[PDB]
Design a binder for this molecule. Structure first.
Ligand code: GGB
Length: 582
């Protein structure tokens, strides 16, 4: 059946009701918001607010309370509204049908937590992680990965078709010295696949030679020209270096549970040729100091698309990239998950793209999802540079250390030696990030994100186990619960079970908002809000003598399951893999 965006529903029935009360008005505000207080109803409509101000005139100000009246007067029949109240000025407070909420709570237990999805299959392309080959994958790359994996999942769950592209820096000029060095240190690479160790100790070996030996430097620069010329021997040496890089990288994408089509800058070697010609032939190119540059009317900087020496650039690659994503992949939306240091870069690229006619931003969504830098607690850059695998190993350890109080004796081997340990570590590292606005800088603290209390993954993961233990400890297997759900009316007479009930149905309205601003932290803020609504429900209501059985209220067994299902999905979107026991 799939869940209902209640906010979008109330917006439909108010726009019907507003068109009736003021049909001569054009595009009136349909600001419907959840009431975050018991008395004011379950949703609020602040629409007589902006409607009064549209009718405002030099010497006449229509009082909003009289509008709200004229609005409620024409409210159609529905399936979700009990009564309507007017407070203050023209606030319209809305009360939901208990029946409606109950029926909806049920529907997601039998049909399950799934979204309605679309009437057209749009194609979202998400550009994330993107480390630079031969250089360490750094924490800023980590954010992108985490944020990108989660964004990809939100659209995947929303019914979109999603292309996860790892746009890796595998076409740098630094390959020159690596390849030239590889040919020195391992003169049989063509035949004996060379044992290159740590790619960082190798790179170091090169930049020394580069900065030291002048005849080596020239060789290095020549290798780049030869590589771009697609030379057989030189290219093989390149493939082999990216190979050693690729398998160290997968160790990380594996641990963080991340799927990615690798499609580096090198993928566009030929399109770049055509792009340069395509900008030339439309007269957008200007020659400055031997560079072919492009000025975009409005932008603070120019794109360099050919250097003085014939070599392409980041701008060249990202121009080729957006043309093919728009034309061959035929995307309806493109998302770039890249550190905010490069904000200007994408606004100029996107501009350049409109300028040459590649897309109509009214029609195709192109979006830079930016993020702040990673800091230590001393509120400056995060360094020691930190290897990502080290960070995670140091996460796994710490996660384990916590668990030794004293759960190594309760949970069995699997439930703990992985399940709880890993699900907590990786879960915290993702959650600490996503729970904070992606734009603000991020303070990476093992101590803060591993805290057993507060707004951490740790608390919410533990919290999850308790919701699951309830119907477990009272011995009600899945088979029973599914039959209960199919036959039980769900009861919401008690205040705190009404809070929890409508909090639950807010899941769609939450995710929709995130499809528009890509602010995932409002989902974490929702998992915490849901999680807290539950405790307040549990601490007063009974689900389950002073001898054994305190009777089972089967409908509250289902409430617990509703809460569980929705947290389960919310976790999945965020990239958290919850355990049951811990
Ligand atoms: N420009 C695109 N498509 N992705 O960003 C690439 C990130 C780059 N490799 C870096 O090191 O920042």
């Amino acid at each position: 059946a799939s869940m209902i965006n209640i906010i979008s529903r109330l917006q439909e029935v108010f726009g019907h009701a507003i068109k009736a009360a003021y049909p001569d008005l054009e595009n009136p505000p349909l600001l419907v918001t959840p009431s975050q207080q018991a008395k004011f109803g379950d949703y609020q409509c602040n629409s007589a607010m902006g409607i009064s101000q549209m009718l405002k005139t030099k010497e006449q100000k229509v009082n909003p309370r009289e509008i709200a009246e004229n609005i409620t007067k024409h409210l159609p029949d529905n399936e979700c509204i009990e009564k309507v109240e007017i407070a203050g000025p023209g606030f319209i407070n809305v009360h939901l049908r208990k029946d409606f909420v109950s029926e909806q709570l049920t529907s997601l237990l039998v049909n399950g937590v799934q979204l309605p999805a679309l009437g057209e299959n749009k194609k979202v392309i998400v550009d994330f992680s993107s480390p630079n080959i031969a250089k360490e994958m750094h924490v800023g790359h980590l954010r992108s990965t985490i944020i990108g994996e989660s964004i990809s999942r939100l659209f995947e769950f929303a019914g979109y078709d999603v292309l996860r592209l790892n746009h890796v820096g595998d076409w740098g000029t630094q390959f020159g010295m690596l390849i030239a060095h590889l040919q020195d240190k391992f003169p049989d690479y063509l035949t004996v696949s060379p044992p290159i160790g740590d790619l960082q100790v190798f790179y170091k070996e090169s930049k020394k030679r580069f900065d030291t030996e002048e005849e080596f430097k020239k060789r290095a620069y020549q290798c780049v020209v030869l590589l771009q010329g697609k030379n057989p021997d030189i290219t093989k040496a390149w493939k082999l270096i990216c190979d050693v890089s690729r398998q160290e990288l997968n160790k990380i994408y594996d641990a963080l549970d991340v799927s990615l089509i690798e499609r580096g800058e090198s993928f566009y070697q030929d399109r770049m040729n055509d792009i340069v010609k395509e900008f030339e032939d439309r007269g957008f190119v200007q020659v400055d100091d031997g560079r072919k540059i492009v000025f975009v009317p409005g932008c603070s900087i120019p794109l360099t698309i050919v250097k003085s020496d014939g070599g392409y650039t980041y701008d060249t690659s990202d121009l080729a990239a957006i043309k093919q994503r728009l034309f061959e992949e035929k995307a309806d939306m493109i998302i770039y998950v890249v550190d905010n240091g490069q904000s200007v870069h994408f606004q100029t690229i996107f501009a350049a793209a409109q300028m040459i006619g590649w897309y109509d931003p009214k029609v195709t969504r192109v979006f830079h999802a930016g993020f702040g830098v990673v800091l230590g607690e001393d509120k400056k850059k995060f360094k020691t540079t930190v290897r990502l695998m080290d960070l995670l190993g140091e996460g796994l350890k710490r996660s384990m250390d916590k668990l030794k109080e004293k759960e190594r004796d309760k949970v069995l081997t699997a439930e703990e030696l992985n399940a709880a340990q890993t699900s907590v570590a990786y879960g915290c590292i993702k959650y600490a990030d996503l729970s904070r606005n992606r734009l603000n800088d991020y303070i990476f603290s093992f101590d803060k994100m591993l805290d057993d209390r507060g707004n951490t993954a740790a608390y919410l993961l533990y919290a999850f186990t308790r919701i699951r233990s309830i119907a477990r400890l009272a011995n009600i297997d899945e088979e029973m619960l599914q039959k209960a759900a199919r036959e039980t009316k769900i009861l919401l007479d008690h205040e705190k079970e009404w809070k929890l009930g409508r909090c639950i149905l807010r899941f769609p309205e939450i995710l929709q908002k995130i499809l528009d601003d890509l602010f995932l932290h409002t989902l974490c803020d929702y998992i915490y809000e849901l999680a807290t609504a539950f405790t307040e429900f549990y601490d007063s209501c009974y689900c389950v003598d002073r001898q054994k059985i305190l009777k089972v209220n089967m409908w509250r067994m289902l409430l617990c399951e509703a809460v569980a299902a929705v947290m389960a999905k919310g976790f999945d979107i965020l990239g958290i893999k919850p355990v049951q026991r811990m």
